[PDB]
Amino acid sequence: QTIQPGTGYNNGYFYSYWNDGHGGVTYTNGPGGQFSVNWSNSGNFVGGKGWQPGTKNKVINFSGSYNPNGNSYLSVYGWSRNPLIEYYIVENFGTYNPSTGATKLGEVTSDGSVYDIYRTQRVNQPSIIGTATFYQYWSVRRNHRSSGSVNTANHFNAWAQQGLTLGTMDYQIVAVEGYFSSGSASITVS
């Protein structure tokens, strides 16, 4: 049901909901792997369902609707530790392609589309272990979609081939992220 920022388990799935406190966003956990998010002139937020810990060979399935009006992403999102890495497999997005200005490190074909691979760096930013400097890895889908199946191994292997190594897996979720925008989404993970 509607909750405030936090993490935990719901119907067998790990969930994480975070927001910068600006207001304008409603996150709701549904049955099974379902979650919904409605937002209006929000601040920055991330919310979704998945696993804790994730794995390097998981096949993630998602089904739903995603209607952003502004800056927002729909991705398989997660972290690794040692090295500390924040990663995204972006299936859809609004007005901003998050790879803008990033360094392209390759291409990978998976689950019906080519994805462009990028690496960026976050300097002294919040992370799962506190303020730190770490890299972000991206796989950005060329053919946008709001339902599908993601073979994570194809991405992690393509990244490693290019020198983008991952450490020990931390959480891994299907998330809706927004940055001062509006929209609605209803996604079911499995």
Swiss-Prot record:
Glycan attachment residues as annotated in the record: N38, N61
Entry-annotated residues carrying Pyrrolidone carboxylic acid: Q1
Pfam families, per the entry: Glyco_hydro_11
UniProt pathway: Glycan degradation; xylan degradation
Reaction(s) this enzyme catalyzes, per UniProt: Endohydrolysis of (1->4)-beta-D-xylosidic linkages in xylans
Active-site annotation: E86 (nucleophile), E177 (proton donor)
InterPro entries: ConA-like_dom_sf, GH11/12, GH11_AS_1, GH11_AS_2, GH11_dom, Glyco_hydro_11
GO cellular component assignments: extracellular region
Principal subcellular localisation of the protein: secreted
Record EC number: 3.2.1.8
Molecular function terms from GO: endo-1,4-beta-xylanase activity
GH11 domain residues: 1-189
pH dependence of function: Optimum pH is 4.5-5.5. Stable from pH 3.0 to 8.5 at room temperature and from pH 4.0 to 7.5 at 40 degrees Celsius.
One of the GO BP terms on file: xylan catabolic process
Lineage top rank: taxon: Eukaryota
Subcellular location: Secreted
Induction: Induced by D-xylose, dependent on the cellulase and xylanase regulator xyr1. Repressed by glucose through negative regulation by the crabon catabolite repressor cre1.
Keywords for the protein's UniProt record, in alphabetical order: Carbohydrate metabolism, Glycoprotein, Glycosidase, Hydrolase, Polysaccharide degradation, Pyrrolidone carboxylic acid, Secreted, Signal, Xylan degradation
Binding site for substrate: Y73, Y77, Y88, R122, P126, Q136, Y171
Similarity section: Belongs to the glycosyl hydrolase 11 (cellulase G) family.
Known role: Glycoside hydrolase involved in the hydrolysis of xylan, a major plant cell wall hemicellulose made up of 1,4-beta-linked D-xylopyranose residues. Catalyzes the endohydrolysis of the main-chain 1,4-beta-glycosidic bonds connecting the xylose subunits yielding various xylooligosaccharides and xylose. The catalysis proceeds by a double-displacement reaction mechanism with a putative covalent glycosyl-enzyme intermediate, with retention of the anomeric configuration. Produces xylobiose and xylose as the main degradation products.
The protein's name: Endo-1,4-beta-xylanase 2
Lineage of producing organism: Eukaryota, Fungi, Dikarya, Ascomycota, Pezizomycotina
Recorded name of the encoding gene: xyn2
